Design a protein around this ligand. Structure first.
Ligand SMILES: NC(=O)c1ccc[n+]([C@@H]2O[C@H](COP(=O)([O-])OP(=O)(O)OC[C@H]3O[C@@H](n4cnc5c(N)ncnc54)[C@H](OP(=O)(O)O)[C@@H]3O)[C@@H](O)[C@H]2O)c1
Ligand SMILES: NC(=O)c1ccc[n+]([C@@H]2O[C@H](COP(=O)([O-])OP(=O)(O)OC[C@H]3O[C@@H](n4cnc5c(N)ncnc54)[C@H](OP(=O)(O)O)[C@@H]3O)[C@@H](O)[C@H]2O)c1
Ligand SMILES: NC(=O)c1ccc[n+]([C@@H]2O[C@H](COP(=O)([O-])OP(=O)(O)OC[C@H]3O[C@@H](n4cnc5c(N)ncnc54)[C@H](OP(=O)(O)O)[C@@H]3O)[C@@H](O)[C@H]2O)c1
Ligand SMILES: NC(=O)c1ccc[n+]([C@@H]2O[C@H](COP(=O)([O-])OP(=O)(O)OC[C@H]3O[C@@H](n4cnc5c(N)ncnc54)[C@H](OP(=O)(O)O)[C@@H]3O)[C@@H](O)[C@H]2O)c1
Ligand SMILES: Nc1nc2ccccc2n1Cc1ccc(Cl)c(Cl)c1
Ligand SMILES: Nc1nc2ccccc2n1Cc1ccc(Cl)c(Cl)c1
Ligand SMILES: Nc1nc2ccccc2n1Cc1ccc(Cl)c(Cl)c1
Ligand SMILES: Nc1nc2ccccc2n1Cc1ccc(Cl)c(Cl)c1
Ligand SMILES: Nc1nc2ccccc2n1Cc1ccc(Cl)c(Cl)c1
Lengths: 249, 248, 248, 249
C-alpha cells in the first residue's frame, strides 16, 4: 500500500513542487489550500490522471483562532478519510507581509503571520502525532531567519518559532519514531507581484549561480528528509540557499 | 533621571532588575499581573529611598484583542509618571508544559506566545513610537536550542523572542534604540518545585553547581542598558554558568 | 564517463562506508589511508572486483608539517592520474584523542589534531580547486558546540572545519564547486569499548537509543554530492538522531 | 594586593585600549607585543607613571612552531615574575591577511594565522590554568565568523577554532573557578590610511550609527566580562558589532 502525505499550501509554487515530487515518489497526497481553489483542483486533476484516486484537495484557513485546532485536526482527518493513513506532514503554508514597528489590525497580523508560520504547524503536529513505517514531518523554515529583513518582525518571529517547534517536536516525538526536520530556503520563487528588475537585485546576491532556487530544488531536500536515506536524521534544518545566508553586508 | 519599564517586576528576576535599575538611578515602572501586593511593596521600598521614583502598572499580557491597548498603556504609564521612557525590559513570562500527545490549547497559545513574544513585540512598537541612551532588553533562554520535553509552546515563544530581539535591533537602530537579550540557563527555580528536583537541576551547572541568583541575571541587564554597552545591539548574553554547553 | 571521488581515511568505518556508497552510485574512488594499508587494499580489491579499474589507494600522513601541502597536492593528483578527473572530495580522516588543559608533546598533538581535522582539509580544498557536479563534503561534528571534557584540540579542529566549509562554499561558488558538511553525533562506537559504556552513550540518542551506522552517515554524503543537492552549498547536515538537541 | 592581567598584542589598537582600561580598573598588566616595541614600552611608561611598578612588557612571536608552548609558558611566567599572580588573560594578538584558495609559503600562513588566532590562545590557556579570587580568560573572537569574507579562509578557521576553545575551556576550567568568555567585534576603528571610499563602504554597513566601534567600546565589554558583575557568565561570546552580524546581503 502507498504511503500518504499532507502538504499545506500546496496549490502552487514550492508547495505544489513538494506535492508533485512526493506523488512521483509514490505518495498519495492531500493538497491543502486556502484561496487558490482553481490551482489546487487543477493539480489534483493532473495527479489523479497519472494515478487514479491518489490526490485530494482540502480547504482551510490556517490563521490563528479558537477553531484553528479543529481545522488542523480536520486536515489530518482528511488524509485518513481519503487514504486510510498519514505518513508525512509538510508544513509549507505561510502568510508573508511586512509589519513595521514604527488595513489589517495588528491582532489580525499576529493571527495570520504567527498562526500560519507557527501555531498551525504546532497543531497539525499534535494532530498528526495523536493519530499514529517511515513517519516524518518537514517544516519550511527560513535560511535567513537570523539575518532579518527590515519591517518583517512578525513574519521573522513566526519562522523563529518554527525552528523551536522543529527541534522540540523532534525530541518529543522521537519515542514514536516520528522524525521532524526542516528545509530552509534563502531565496527561491520570488513574489508574483515583484518586477523583474527587483527580482534581479535579489538574485544577484546568491553566491551559487546568482539565481534563486527552483521550486524543484527545495522539493528535492524535502524528498530526501522523508526518505529512508534520512532515517537517522531528526531535528535537522537543511539550508537550500546557494550560500546566501553566509553572505555578509 | 532616566526611566525604565520592567514587566513582571513584582518578584524574582524582574524584581531584581527593577531594584538594580533603581539603584543605578532610574525611575521605574513596576508592571505586574497577579502580584499586586508584592508590586506595591517593592514600589514602597524604592520610594522610601527616593520619593516618587517608582510606580506600579497592572496588565494581563496574554494575547487578545485588547493586548495592543494594554501594552500602549504600560508605555504610557512611564511617560505619565516620569515624562520619558528610556529602557524597556521584557521579563514577564508564562511558563508551563504543553504536551504534543484545564486550559484549552488556544488559551495556552494566547498565554505562552502572548507573554513571551507578542507582548514584547507590542511593547517594543509602543516604546519606539513614543520616541540619550535608549534600549530594550528581552529575557531570553540560554537553553532555547536544547528544549525540554513537553514545552513546545514555551520554547516557540522564546524562539520568537530571539527573532524579535534581532529584528527590532536592526529596525530600530536608525532611532538609536538598542535591542539586546539576557539568557538565563537555570536561575531561581519554580516555587512549586520540590527540593530534591531543584538539586538535580542545580548539579548540572558547570560553574559552581548552582543556579544564578536574580541579582546575577540583573547584572547583565544593567550592563546592556549602560553607557558601557552603547555599541552593543542585537546581542544575546547567556548568563548560564556554562549550562548550554553541556552535552547529554 | 564515470565521475571520480577522493575519500580521506577511507580504509575503515565511516570513510569505508562513504567510499563503498560512492562506488555503488557509479563513482571511481581514491581510497586514502594512513596506517591501514591492508584494509585499504582489501577495499580496493573488493571494488575492482565489482568494476575493473575503478578504485585505487593513496597513502599519506595528514598531520600538519612543512610537507603537508605537497602531500595533499599529491592526493588530488593521484585522482587525476588514475581517472582523469576529480569531481568529489570527502574530508573524513581525523585524529581523535583527549588533550587535557591541566607520550606525545603538545606540539605533536596540535599537529595531528589540527592537521587532520582542519589544515589538511584546507590544503586538499586548495589543491582540488586549483585543478578545476563538483563538490566537497567535510565530516563535521554535530556536538561541536557541546564540547567533551578534555578534547579542546579536537574540538578546535572541528570548529575550524566549520569555518572552512563556510569560507570555501563562498569562495568556490564562482567555480560551481559546492562545499558542505555532514555532522555525526554518535556513530560507529569503537569495537573495544565496553558494551556497558557503549550503552551509556546509546541511551542518550532520542531517535532509537542507538548510534548511527556508518551507512547512515554515508547516505547524507551521497545526498550532498548528488544532483538533488545542486543548490545546496555551505550547509552542514546533522545526522545525529536528535542528540545535539538533548540538554544536560 | 592588586590583581594582574596578561593582554596579548597590547601595544596598539584594541589590545592597547583593553590594557589601559584594565589598568584603570586597578589591574597590574603584562603588555605583550611582537613587533611594536616602541609602542609597548611607551604604554608601559604611561601606565607606570600613573602607578609605579604596575606594567611590564613581554615580547613574543605567537606563530605556531615547536617552541610556541615554551613562548606561551614564558608569557604567563612573566606575569608571575613581575606581579606574583595572574588573574586575567586576554587573548587579543592576531595575524590577519588574505589567503586565497586559488611572499610567505602556505605553511607559514597556516603557522601565523592558526598559531596567533587559535594555538597560542590554547597554549596560553593551558599555562594560565596550570599556574593557578576572580580568575577569567577573554578571547577576542569575530562577530562575522559565520559570514566569512572572500579569501580569508585561514583567518576564519583560526577565529572559528577560537570559539571552540572558548567553549571547551569554559567547561573544562569551570571546576577551578576560571571563567572563559569572548568578545566579538564587527568592525572597529579603521586605519586612517585606508581609502575614504573604502572606509565609508564598510562603515555604512553598520546599522547602529553607520560607524565602527572605538577600541574603548570593545574594551568596555572585556572589562564587564572580567568584573564581579559577570561572575556567573562563562562560555559566552558577546558581540560588540552595532548590529553588523544581523545584516543580510
Ligand atoms: N519563496 C522563497 O524565496 C522562500 C524563502 C524562505 C522561506 N520560504 C518558505 O517556503 C515555503 C514556501 O514558499 P512559497 O514562496 O512557495 O510560499 P507562498 O507562495 O508565499 O505561500 C504558500 C501558500 O501559503 C498559503 N497561505 C497563505 N496564508 C494562508 C492562510 N491564512 N491559511 C492557509 N494557507 C495560507 C497560500 O495558499 P493559497 O494560495 O491556497 O491561498 C499560499 O499559496 C513558505 O513556508 C515560505 O515561508 C520561501
Ligand atoms: N528562572 C529561570 O531559571 C529562567 C530560565 C530561563 C529563562 N528565564 C526567563 O527569565 C525571565 C524571568 O524569570 P522568572 O523565573 O523570574 O519568571 P517567572 O517568575 O516565571 O515570571 C515572572 C512574572 O511574569 C509575569 N506573568 C506571568 N504570566 C503573565 C501574564 N499572563 N500577564 C502578565 N504577566 C505575566 C508574572 O507576574 P505576576 O506575578 O504579577 O502575576 C510573574 O511574576 C522570564 O522571562 C523567564 O522566561 C528564567
Ligand atoms: N564516529 C563518530 O561517532 C563521529 C562523531 C562525530 C564526528 N565524527 C567524524 O566523522 C569522521 C569519520 O568518523 P570515524 O569514527 O569513522 O573516524 P576515525 O575512525 O576516528 O578516523 C578515520 C581515519 O582517519 C585516519 N587518520 C587518523 N589520523 C590520521 C593522520 N595523521 N593522517 C592521515 N589519516 C589519519 C585513519 O586512517 P588509518 O586507519 O588508515 O590510519 C582513520 O582510519 C571523522 O572525521 C570523525 O571526526 C565521527
Ligand atoms: N578591529 C576589528 O574590526 C576586528 C574585527 C573582528 C575581530 N577582531 C579581533 O579583535 C582583536 C583586536 O583587533 P585589532 O584590530 O586591534 O588587532 P590587530 O591590530 O589586527 O592585531 C593586534 C596585534 O596582534 C599582534 N600580532 C600579529 N601577529 C602576531 C604574531 N605573529 N605574534 C604575536 N603577536 C602578533 C600584533 O602585535 P605587534 O603590533 O606588537 O606586532 C598586533 O598589533 C584581534 O584578535 C582581531 O582579530 C578585530
Ligand atoms: N529568506 C527570506 N526571509 C525573508 C523575510 C522577509 C523578506 C524577504 C525574506 N527572504 C528572502 C531574502 C532575504 C534576504 C535576501 Cl539578501 C534575499 Cl536575496 C532574499
Ligand atoms: N532554561 C530553561 N528553559 C526551559 C524550558 C522548559 C523547562 C525548563 C527550562 N529551563 C531550565 C533548565 C533547562 C535545562 C536544564 Cl539541564 C536545566 Cl538545569 C534547567
Ligand atoms: N560527537 C562527538 N564529539 C566528541 C568529542 C569528544 C568525545 C566524544 C565526542 N562525540 C561523541 C559523543 C559526544 C557526546 C555525547 Cl552525549 C555522545 Cl552520546 C557522543
Ligand atoms: N590588522 C589589520 N589589518 C588591517 C587592514 C585594514 C583594516 C583593518 C586591519 N586590521 C585590524 C583588523 C583585524 C582583523 C579584522 Cl577582522 C578587522 Cl575588521 C580589522
Ligand atoms: N569582522 C570581520 N571579520 C573579517 C574577516 C576578513 C575581513 C574583514 C573582516 N571583518 C570586518 C568586516 C566584515 C564584514 C563587513 Cl560587512 C564589515 Cl563592514 C566589516
Amino acid at each position: 500500500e502507498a504511503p500518504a502525505a499532507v502538504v499545506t499550501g500546496a496549490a502552487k509554487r514550492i508547495g505544489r513542487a513538494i506535492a508533485v515530487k512526493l506523488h512521483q515518489t509514490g505518495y498519495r497526497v492531500v493538497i491543502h489550500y486556502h484561496n487558490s481553489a482553481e490551482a489546487a483542483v487543477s493539480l489534483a486533476d493532473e495527479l489523479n490522471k497519472e494515478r487514479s484516486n491518489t490526490a485530494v484537495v482540502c480547504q482551510a484557513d490556517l490563521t490563528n483562532s479558537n477553531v484553528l485546532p479543529a481545522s488542523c485536526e480536520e486536515i489530518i482527518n482528511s488524509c485518513f478519510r481519503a487514504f486510510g493513513r498519514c505518513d508525512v506532514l509538510v508544513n509549507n503554508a505561510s502568510a508573508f507581509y511586512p509589519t513595521p514597528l514604527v488595513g489589517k489590525t495588528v491582532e489580525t497580523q499576529v493571527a495570520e503571520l504567527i498562526g500560519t508560520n507557527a501555531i498551525a504547524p504546532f497543531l497539525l503536529t499534535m494532530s498528526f502525532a495523536q493519530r499514529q513505517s517511515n513517519l516524518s514531518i518537514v517544516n519550511l523554515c527560513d535560511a535567513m531567519v537570523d539575518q532579518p529583513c527590515m519591517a518583517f518582525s512578525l513574519y521573522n518571529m513566526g519562522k523563529h518559532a518554527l525552528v523551536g517547534l522543529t527541534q522540540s517536536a523532534a525530541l518529543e516525538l522521537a519515542p514514536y519514531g516520528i522524525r521532524v526536520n526542516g528545509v530552509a530556503p534563502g531565496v527561491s520563487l520570488l513574489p508574483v507581484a515583484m518586477g523583474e528588475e527587483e527580482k534581479d537585485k535579489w538574485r544577484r546576491k546568491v553566491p551559487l549561480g546568482r539565481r534563486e532556487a527552483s521550486a524543484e530544488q527545495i522539493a528535492d531536500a524535502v524528498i530526501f528528509l522523508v526518505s529512508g536515506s534520512a532515517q537517522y536524521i531528526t531535528g535537522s534544518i537543511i539550508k537550500v540557499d546557494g550560500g546566501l545566508s553566509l553572505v555578509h553586508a
